[PDB]
Amino acid sequence: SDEF
Amino acid sequence: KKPTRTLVMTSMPSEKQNVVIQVVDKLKGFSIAPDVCETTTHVLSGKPLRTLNVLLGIARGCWVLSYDWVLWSLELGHWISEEPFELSHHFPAAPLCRSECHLSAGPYRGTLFADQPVMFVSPASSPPVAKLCELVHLCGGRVSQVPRQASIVIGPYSGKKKATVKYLSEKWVLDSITQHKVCAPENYLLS
Numbered sequence: 381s382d383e384f
Numbered sequence: 385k386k387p388t389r390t391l392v393m394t395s396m397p398s399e400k401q402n403v404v405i406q407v408v409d410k411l412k413g414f415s416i417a418p419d420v421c422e423t424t425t426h427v428l429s430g431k432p433l434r435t436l437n438v439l440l441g442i443a444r445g446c447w448v449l450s451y452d453w454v455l456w457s458l459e460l461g462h463w464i465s466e467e468p469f470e471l472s473h474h475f476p477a478a479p480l481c482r483s484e485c486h487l488s489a490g491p492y493r494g495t496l497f498a499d500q501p502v503m504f505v506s507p508a509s510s511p512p513v514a515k516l517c518e519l520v521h522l523c524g525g526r527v528s529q530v531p532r533q534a535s536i537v538i539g540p541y542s543g544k545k546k547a548t549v550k551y552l553s554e555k556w557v558l559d560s561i562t563q564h565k566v567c568a569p570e571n572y573l574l575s
Contacts, residue, residue, distance in 0.1 A: 381394055381395060381433075381435040381436065381437065382435065382436070382511070383433045383434050383435060384434050384435070384436070384439065384510075384511050384554075384555075384558055
């Protein structure tokens, strides 16, 4: 799950 | 039957994932959604990172807890108190929207971006536009389907820049959500  | 409220997992290794599913099976009381939605009340992180599901959880005022709360909930055999394990230090906004949602008069909608202009979010933005528009709406802001109505633009924008408009980065939205504070627009300018 990509971080932002 | 199915419990209505939903428990979502983010930054969660598979070996840890199965444990959660299984504590939900034995203790009952939840349904597991793959993504934070209308029913989500609890969000569990394996490694405190700012994922789509942690941003959204903050927008809905959900509990945002460490994997610890499951371990102890198992060791005790019931869903214990959430407060001791919510990630205050990493996301100082979570505890605010959590309390704010639980003392809400009617249903809960954030008030953060409520005193802001109308924003237009570009489709080529990262994170995806659908979830980032959702974030802005859940928090109070109003979004437009076409830039001419917006006084603020967000994300990659190639078209002629506009003096009556502030063109900013996505992290302006994200950082304001994480800090529970409308950050200064002059240091989130996208050029």
